[PDB]
Specification:
- This protein has 303 residues and is of the alpha/beta class.
- It folds into two domains: 135 residues, Rossmann fold (3-Layer(aba) Sandwich), CATH 3.40.50; 133 residues, Rossmann fold, CATH 3.40.50.
- Helix content is 40%, strand content 17%.
- It is built from ten helices and 13 strands.
- The strands form two sheets. Strands 6, 7, 8, 9, 10, 11 and 13 form a seven-stranded mixed β-sheet that branches. A six-stranded parallel β-sheet has the order 2-1-3-4-5-12, sandwiched between helices.
- Helix 1 runs parallel beside helix 9, helix 4 packs across helix 5 and helix 6 crosses helix 7.
- The longest helix has 17 residues.
- The radius of gyration is 20 Å and the shape is elongated.
- The structure holds alpha-D-tagatopyranose.
- The site of alpha-D-tagatopyranose has 12 residues, from helix 1.
- Belongs to the bacterial solute-binding protein 2 family.
Length: 303
């Protein structure tokens, strides 16, 4: 910044048009300004390793000093990132991981990133389950609206949700509906589940798009406030949807925190400081009442 070496740190999101990654980027720019770095930001328009890897390659060719990336596949991003590693480029994964997400252990094929910075996503799921159980009075039929098997974060949220719900004997967990990150698909799946199950009590959307689509489906079905919704992430729409009763809880991650600590950790590494192999960022649970608490509303995602 002042006497600091000025670095070029790349940030590759999972998806460009996603308020989570947009807000992560905001946090990253704030940290970059603080320690004198420039962010090289580039992403694909879908959460998809086929389109993310060419972006990663374009970024590698810009010879950044470090790479922050949210890999869109735990296995298919390993060898492409390994190329960056072998070219001397240090990296951190944000939000999602490659391998197991256990890094610098000295073994395994996806061991070379320096750190994994993300929410505690299993906990996120357990929190969503407890919130939904509260909303439905601890009985009735529910299901998880999710993206696609194999996405590390949403896999963990579904596991945490199901393990928590197993402790609630009056609750029935119906089959997970996978929407491939498409809110309109999630809405149509809500409609199908509700048509087969007029007694459906609630739904947990395990990421932004799943929650938005599921909520939109409930509204279109005429069941706002009757079918309870717990939505992961906190796009701007949660203000109106909490107010109207369409969703009961939004589980906000802290993407700016993820971005911020990603850039600072890269800077620390580049100046010879050891960094943690894991940093876990928290949640803010937003409801109808506290969404106007200032300390809370500031966690609603940008854009
Ligand atoms: O906002 C949606 C989102 O980006 O979907 C993928 C997840 O890995 C992110 O944590 C976030 O839920």
């Amino acid at each position: 910044s002042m006497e600091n070496k000025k670095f070029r740190i790349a940030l590759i999101p999972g998806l460009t048009t996603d308020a989570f990654y947009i807000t992560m980027h905001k946090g990253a720019e704030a940290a970059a300004a603080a320690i004198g770095a420039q962010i090289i930001f580039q992403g694909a328009p879908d959460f998809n390793p086929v389109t993310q890897v060419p972006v990663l390659d374009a970024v590698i060719a810009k010879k950044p000093d470090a790479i922050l990336i949210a890999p869109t596949d735990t296995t298919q991003l390993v060898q492409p990132l390994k190329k960056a590693a072998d070219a001397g480029i240090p990296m951190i994964t944000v939000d999602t991981f490659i391998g197991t997400g256990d890094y610098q252990t000295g073994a395994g094929d996806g061991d070379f990133p320096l750190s994994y910075i993300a929410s505690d996503n299993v906990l996120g799921g357990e929190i969503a389950a407890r919130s939904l159980a509260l909303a439905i009075g601890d009985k009735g039929k529910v299901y998880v609206s999710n993206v696609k098997p194999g996405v590390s974060t949403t896999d963990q949220r579904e596991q945490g949700f199901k393990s928590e719900m197993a402790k609630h004997p009056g609750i029935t967990v119906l089959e997970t509906q996978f929407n491939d990150n498409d809110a309109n698909k999630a809405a149509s799946q809500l409609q199908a589940v509700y048509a087969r199950n007029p007694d459906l009590a609630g739904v947990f959307g395990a990421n932004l798009f799943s929650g938005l689509g599921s909520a939109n489906g409930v509204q279109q079905a005429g069941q706002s406030g009757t079918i309870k919704v717990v939505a992961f992430d906190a796009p701007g729409s949660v203000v109106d949807n909490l107010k109207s009763g369409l969703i009961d809880f939004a589980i906000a991650q802290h993407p700016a925190e993820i971005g911020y600590y990603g850039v600072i950790s890269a800077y620390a590494h580049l100046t010879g400081q050891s960094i943690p192999t894991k940093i876990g960022t928290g949640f803010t649970v937003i409801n109808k009442s506290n969404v106007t608490d200032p300390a809370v509303a500031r966690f609603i995602y940008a854009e």
